[PDB]
From a paper:
Subsequently it was discovered that in [name] an [name] (MCLC) catalyzes three different steps in the 3-hydroxypropionate bi-cycle for autotrophic CO2 fixation. In the absence of substrates recombinant MCLC crystallized in the orthorhombic space group P 2 21 21 with one hexamer per asymmetric unit (AU). The crystals diffracted to a resolution of 2.5 Å and the structure was solved using the molecular replacement method. Only 4 to 6 residues were not built in a loop region (residues 210 – 215) of each chain due to the lack of sufficient electron density. As with other members of the [name]-like superfamily and malate synthases, the core of the MCLC monomer constitutes a β8/α8 TIM-barrel. In addition to the central TIM-barrel there is a C-terminal domain (starting at Phe287) that comprises three α-helices of which two are connected by a β-hairpin (residues 310–317). This C-terminal domain extends to the neighboring subunit. In both MCLC structures (with and without bound substrates) additional electron density was observed at the 3-fold rotation axis in each trimer and was modeled as Tris molecules. These form hydrogen bonds with the side chain amide oxygens of Gln221 in each subunit of the trimer, as well as with backbone oxygen atoms of Asp222. The Tris molecules are buried within the protein and do not appear to be solvent accessible, which may indicate that the additional insertion domain (residues 182–220) found after the sixth β-strand of the TIM-barrel is able to undergo a conformational change.
[name] ([name]) is a promiscuous carbon-carbon bond lyase that catalyzes the reversible cleavage of structurally related Coenzyme A (CoA) thioesters. Malyl-CoA lyases are promiscuous enzymes that accept a variety of substrates and can catalyze the reversible aldol condensation of CoA thioesters like acetyl-CoA or propionyl-CoA with 2-oxoacids like glyoxylate or pyruvate. The two MCLs share the common fold of a central TIM-barrel with small elaborations, as well as an additional C-terminal domain. In both cases the oligomeric state constitutes a dimer of trimers.
Numbering used by the authors:
A (entry chain D), E (entry chain C): 2 to 209, 214 to 348
B (entry chain E), C (entry chain F): 2 to 209, 215 to 348
D (entry chain B): 2 to 209, 216 to 348
The structure:
C-alpha cells in the first residue's frame, strides 16, 4: 500500500508520468494473434481495422521453439503497421518463464511507443505487479517511452482471486483483469466443459413426470467479485478466452452474461468471434442517451444538479463523460451505432 | 477499527451511552414517504399503524427546490405524531450534498428523541461512518437525546461492497445495510431491467432447441451482504423495488432476500406494504424451535442439548431475539399469534 | 500471521515436525459413526474397508449423558482395529463445551499415533486454530506422537466465512474445511427445506403463467470456500446432506460441490457411501492430463509444454498429487483402475 | 483482533465473565519465591503481608527435577495462606515446555480462586495469548473459578517487542507486560553487564574527551509503556539482578517509574522497600486528582481545573489513582498523611 | 486508508480542491494568544508582524464562561487584521466538548478565507481526522472557501502515539503534528518537573567517591518516532509548548533538541520565546547553500545530476526546492539570514 503522494510518481528518472485515470477507448474485443505465423502477419493491417484492440500472443499455443520467432515477428509487424485507432496489446510469457525477460525488454525497446497495454499471465499477488511496474519504468526511461505502458492482469489461480484487492491497487499502471476460464478451473479444481465456461451437470434438482433440473452458472461468484474489485479501483473487467470456437451460441451467451455483470469486453481467438464481441459489449443505447442528458445539465461537472430525482456530482458526471466519449468513438467506426447513439 | 475498551464509549460529553446490541423490534417493512407532500403527510398517523418501520425521504425523488420543505415537513409530522410501536427512520441527503448538514442537525434538534435510525446514502468506507458518528454524538449531547440514533448504510457503489467489513465494524451505531439495486447496478455497470429486478438475458445456455435457464444477478451481492452483516451483529435489508405494478415479481424478489437471511425490505407504495410483511415474517417452525431453547435454558446458563445439538450462550441470545421478535409481530397479527403461540 | 521461518516449527519440545503439505490419500467420503453404540462399534472393522475416511462423532446427535461413553468407546474401537488404508478422523465437541478438554487430551493420549485428523466444530477465527495447534503440540510431545495431528475446521457461522482466510493460514496443521449446512443456515438466517439442500421458493421469476427458475443457495459459500482453501493448499469438503432417502438430490448436491472443486462429502448412512465415492472420484480427464505432465517432466524441473500450456513446478507437483490419488483409488477399484490406467 | 461484541465473552460455558477494566490494587512490587524450597514456604504466610504482589516461580532458577515439587509446593502454601490484600501471581513454564500443561491445569484446579494473575514466559504473538485464554476459560469453567485469571506477558524476544500491539489487544485477560532484560538482551544480541542493567561503554564521546553514558533501555520501555497504556494495560520493569547494588537498583526502578511503569520485580528482601518507595503514586498527582473527584461528584458534565477540561477519561484516571493511593494508605501511615486518605 | 484516486477529491460539492503538497512558508514559531483578552487582541496587528505563525487559543487556559467570548474575540480580530505573510491558526476545543461545533462552524463561516490551519486537541485515531475532514468540507462548500483549511493534530495520548501512522495518512488536509508534553505525560504516566522539560532523576548511574549521574532525555523516543511518521507522509513535526517561561536557557536547549531531530518549529507561550524559536528553527546555512547547488545543477528538476558524489533525482530536487523557497521567504524578514543564505 504505497502512500498517495508517492503512488503517481514515475519509478525511474526519465520514465513517463503515471496516469491518473484509464484512457477512454473502445475495448469491446481483444483479438489475439500468433505473431510468428507469416500468413497471420500479412493480414494484420486489415484485421486491425475490424477490431477495437489487437493483442499479440507469446504465451499459450506458442511452441517453445517459436518463442523467439513470435517475439521478433511481433516487433516486425508492429514496426510496419499503423494501427490508427486500434489499440495494441501483447501477452508475454509468465514471470517464472525463461522468455519473459527478453519479451518485455526487446519489445519495449523496439516498439514501446506503439504499445498501449501489456498482459501478464498468472498474476497471483501485488509482488508480481511491483516487479513489472519497476521493470517497465526502467525500460521506459531507457528508450524514452512517452506514455506509460499499462498492466493487464490475467486471473488464472485461486490465489489471484483472493489477492484481487492488493493486485488492483498495487500500481497506477493497472488497466484491469481478464478471467481465464480454463486456467482458473484447473487451479480451483473445477470440472467444466468446452475449455471453460460451464458444465451441464451443475444445477438444482427440483422436488418430486421427472424432476426438473435447472442448470446454474459456475462463474457467477468469480465475475461478480472481479467486477466489484475492478470498478472500485477504477479498473475494467474482461472475460478472457472462450475456447469453444465453433459454438457461437454459447459464446455470445457467455459474453452477454459478462456484459450484464459489468464486464467491458472479451477476447476473440478467431475471426468469427470478432463480430460477436463487438456486438455484445457495445454500450446500451438508453444508457448513452441518459448520459447525454447528464452532460447537458452540467457543462463543467461542477455545481449540483438533479436528473430524474437523482442528485448528480463529480462521480456521476465523469462516468457519464466516459460512456459518451466511448460511444462517440464507436460511432465513428459504426454508422449504425452512430445513428442509434445520436453521436 | 477502534480498541474494544473505547468502542462503546460516548463520542461527546452528554451523548447517550452507545448500544451494545441491536434493539429487537419488527423490521419486515421500511415504508418510504415524501414529507413535503401535505396529502401524503396527513395520512401518516394511520399508515404508521400499518408498517413496522416508517422512513422519511429527503434524498431521491425529492426535488432540489423542495429539500427545505421536505426537511421541515418531516419535522412537522413527527412532532405531531405518536408512532407507538412503529420505528421512525429518515434518509438524509448525500454526505457531499449541500443539504446534509442542516438535514441531520435540524432533525436531531427538533425530533431527535423520536428518531431511531438515520439512513446514509452512498456509504463507501468507514470514514463516512466516523463522520456521522462524531457529528451525531455532538448533536445528541447538545439536545440531551436519551437514545443513541443508529446508522443504516445504503450500499450503492462497488467500493461500498468491497469495504463492507470496514463499514460494518466502524461504530456501535451501525444498524445494518440496505441494497440499493438501481444505484449499485449503475456503479458496477450491471445491465438490469427496472429497479430491484434482474435481467432476462442473464442465464445458462444448455448444450446442443437448446434450453435457457435464467440466473439471479444479485446472488453474490445479497450473500456477501448477509455474511458481513450477521458476523458484526447487524441486519441486512433489501432496498427499493421500482416496479410497483408488478407485485408477483416483488414478492418473488423479496422472498429471495428473505431466504438468504435478509430482515426486511423497502416499500415505496401501499400495495407493497402487505407483501413485505408477509414475506419477511419469521419462520414458524424456527420460532417454535427457539421456544424450546428458551425453555431448556431459562436463565440461559449452563449447557443444554436439543435434538442432538448443544446449546451455548450464542444460540440462546439468538433464540431470545426471534421469540421476542415474533411476539411483537404476534401482538398485532392474530394469525401469526396463533401459529407462534405468543 | 506468524513469520515464515517460524510457521513450520513445532510448538512443543518433542512434538512432531509440522507437515509442509497435505498427505495425499482418498478422502472422497467421510463416514460418521457414534462410538458409544456397541452394535455399531462391532461392525467398524468391516465398515472401515468400505470407506476412505472413517470419522468418530462426539459432538452432534451424541447425548450429554453419553459423551463420556462416546469418548471411551472411540478409544476402545480404534485400539483394537487396524484401519489399514482408511483414514481416521474424530469430531470432538465445541471449544467452549465441558467435554472438549477430555476429548482431545484422552484421545491423543491413547490413540494419537492412529489419529490422522481432528474435526473442530464451529471454528470462527484464527484464535480457535491457535489454541488447538498449541494444545495438540503439548499433547503430542507428551505421548511421543510421531505424526502431527491435522486440524479440520467446521464452518457453521457467518463469522467463520468472513474470517475464512485468517483461519486457513493460522497453522500448518490445517487440513481443510467442511460446511455445516444446518448451523451455517441458522447463523445466517437462511431458509432450507433440507439439511444441505436448497429451497424450492428461491429462484428467478420470468417476465410476463410465468416460469420459475430455481437457483442455488450455496453457490457463493462453496465458491468462496474453494478459492480460500485451494489458495492455502487446503481441501474443501461439502459436509452432510440431511435427506437420507433422497439419493437423487443427494447425488446432485454432492455433484455440484464436486464440480466447484470440493474433495469430498460426509455420509450419514450406508447408502450415502457409494454415492460420495462415485461422485468425488477424480475426473478421468484430469488424471490423464496429469500423467502426460509427469511423463513429460521426470524430475519436475526444467521447462516443458503440454497442449500449448507451459509446465512449471506448481503444475508438476499438482499433477503428482492427482496421479498418486488416482493410483490409491485404482488399487481398490478395478473399474477406475482401467479408466485411469493405473 | 476479535470483534467488539465478542471480545468480552467467556470462552467456555461456566467460565467467569471477562473483566472490562483492570482491578485497581497496589502493584508496586512483584516479589518472587521458589515454592519448592520448604524453608521459603514456611515464611510465606508472613512475607505476604510485606509485599503488594507475591509471585510463585516455576520457571527460571527452578531445576528440572524440581519442577513438580515447585508446582505442588505452590499449591500447598497457597492453600494454607490467607493472603488478605496481597495479590497472588504465578510464573509457569514456557508454552513449549513439558511442564506448562500440568502447571496451569493443576494449579487452577486446586487454588484457582486464589490466583489473580498468571505470568507467561516468552510471549511472542497473539497466538500465545489465544491459547492461554482459551485454555484458562475451559479450566475456569470446569473448576467454577469465580473471577477471570488475568494474563501477564513476559517480553523476552525481539519478535515480542515487534508484536506488542498485537499481543496487547488479543484478550480481555491481558493484565500487562514485564520486561525480561537478560533474555531480551540475549535475543537482540544486546550487551549488558548486569541483569536489568545497561553498559558503561554505551555512550557519547565528546568532540576533541568526556564520555557521556546513555540508557540502553530507553526505546524498549518507552515503546512498552505506549502500547500498554493505549490498551489500558500496565507496564512493568522486570528483575534487577545486581542484588547488592541498591543505589543502581533504585536508579533503574526510578527510570522505569518516570517513564510510566507501574512496578518492578524483587529478587531479594532488600529490594522490597526500594520498589515500594519508587513506585508509590506521586503525592501531587494524588492531590490534584482529589480536586477532580470533588469538582465532579458523579464524573458527569463538564468541569475545568487549572485551565484544563475534565471529561470522563480524565475523571476515570483521577478515580483510579485516588483509589490506588487509599489502598496503599491503608498500610502506610506516612503516605496516608501525605495523600490525605 | 482511502484509495489514491479518491484521496485528493473534495468531500463536498463546492469544497475547494485538496492540496497535493504542503504550502511552503516560515513556521519556526507558532505564537499562541487568548482572543478573549482585550489588551492582547488590540496588539495583534503588531505581534503578527513579529511571528511566522499566529495561533488563537480556545481550548486550554480558556475559562468555560469565556468560551463564547474567545470565539467571538477571535472572529473579530481576524476580520479587522490583514495578516500579510503571517499564517493564521486556531486551536478549537476537544472533539467531545460542547464547544467544537460552534468553534469550527462560526469561524469558517466568518473568517474561513483567512484561516490556514486548524489545530485539533487530543487526536487519537484516523476516525477523528475523518470527522474534521468531512465537516470542514461541508462548511467550506457552504461558505465558498477558496483554499482548503489544513488539519494539525495534537498528540496528547498514548493511543495517539501508537496510531500515528493511521492518523498521518487519514486525509490530504494533514499538516503535521504538535507534541503536547503535559497531556501526553499524564496519559502515559510519565513524570516531568516542567511542561515540556524532562526529569532530573531520569538518568544512568555510573559503576562504583560519588558515582556520576548522567541525565537522559525523556522525549527522545517520542520526537524521533513523531519525525519519521511525519516526514514519511510528507508532513511536518513541531515540538509544542515549553511551559517554563522564565528559564530561557532550558527552553532554547529543548527547542534545539527538537530542531536537531528534524522538527519544523515550536510554540511560543510568551513574548520571550518568540526570538528563541525563530533563532533555533531557522534553516541551517549549510543546507541552504547546498540545496541551491542542486537547483542550480538541474533547473527544471528532471534528468540525472550528481552533487558531491550523490545522485540527484525528483525526490531530492523537490526537497531542495522547498528549503530555498523557505530560506528566501525568511530572507525577506531577516537581512542577516538573507546574507547567510544569499537569497
Amino acid at each position: 500500500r504505497k502512500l498517495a503522494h508517492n503512488f503517481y510518481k514515475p519509478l525511474a528518472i526519465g520514465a513517463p508520468e503515471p496516469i491518473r485515470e484509464l484512457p477512454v477507448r473502445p475495448e469491446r474485443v481483444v483479438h489475439f494473434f500468433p505473431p510468428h505465423v507469416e500468413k497471420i502477419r500479412a493480414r494484420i493491417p486489415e484485421v486491425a481495422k475490424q477490431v477495437d484492440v489487437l493483442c499479440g500472443n507469446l504465451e499459450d499455443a506458442i511452441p517453445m521453439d517459436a518463442k523467439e520467432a513470435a517475439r521478433n515477428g511481433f516487433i516486425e509487424v508492429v514496426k510496419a503497421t499503423d494501427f490508427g485507432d486500434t489499440a495494441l496489446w501483447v501477452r508475454v510469457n509468465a514471470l517464472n518463464s525463461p522468455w519473459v525477460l527478453d519479451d518485455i525488454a526487446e519489445i519495449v525497446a523496439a516498439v514501446g511507443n506503439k504499445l498501449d497495454v501489456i498482459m501478464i499471465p498468472k498474476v497471483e499477488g501485488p509482488w508480481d505487479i511491483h516487479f513489472v511496474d519497476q521493470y517497465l519504468a526502467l525500460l521506459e526511461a531507457r528508450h524514452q517511452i512517452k506514455k506509460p505502458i499499462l498492466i493487464h492482469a490475467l486471473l488464472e489461480t485461486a490465489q489471484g482471486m483472493v489477492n484481487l484487492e492488493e493486485i488492483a491497487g498495487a500500481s497506477p499502471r493497472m488497466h484491469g483483469f481478464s478471467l481465464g476460464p480454463a486456467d482458473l478451473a484447473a487451479s480451483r479444481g473445477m470440472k467444466t466443459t468446452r475449455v471453460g465456461g460451464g458444465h451441464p451437470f451443475y444445477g438444482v434438482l427440483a422436488d418430486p413426470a421427472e424432476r426438473p433440473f435447472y442448470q446454474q452458472d459456475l462463474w457467477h461468484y468469480t465475475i461478480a467479485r472481479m467486477v466489484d474489485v475492478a470498478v472500485a479501483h477504477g479498473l475494467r473487467a474482461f472475460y478472457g478466452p472462450f475456447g469453444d470456437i465453433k459454438d457461437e451460441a454459447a459464446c455470445e451467451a457467455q459474453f452477454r452474461n459478462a456484459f450484464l455483470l459489468g464486464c467491458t469486453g472479451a477476447w476473440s481467438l478467431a475471426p468469427n468471434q470478432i463480430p460477436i464481441a463487438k456486438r455484445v459489449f457495445s454500450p446500451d443505447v438508453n444508457e448513452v442517451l441518459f448520459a447525454k442528458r447528464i452532460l447537458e445539465a452540467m457543462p463543467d461537472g461542477s455545481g449540483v444538479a438533479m436528473i430524474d430525482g437523482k442528485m448528480q456530482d463529480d462521480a456521476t458526471w465523469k462516468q457519464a463523460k466516459v460512456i459518451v466519449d466511448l460511444a462517440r468513438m464507436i460511432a465513428k467506426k459504426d454508422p449504425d451505432l452512430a445513428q442509434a447513439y445520436g453521436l
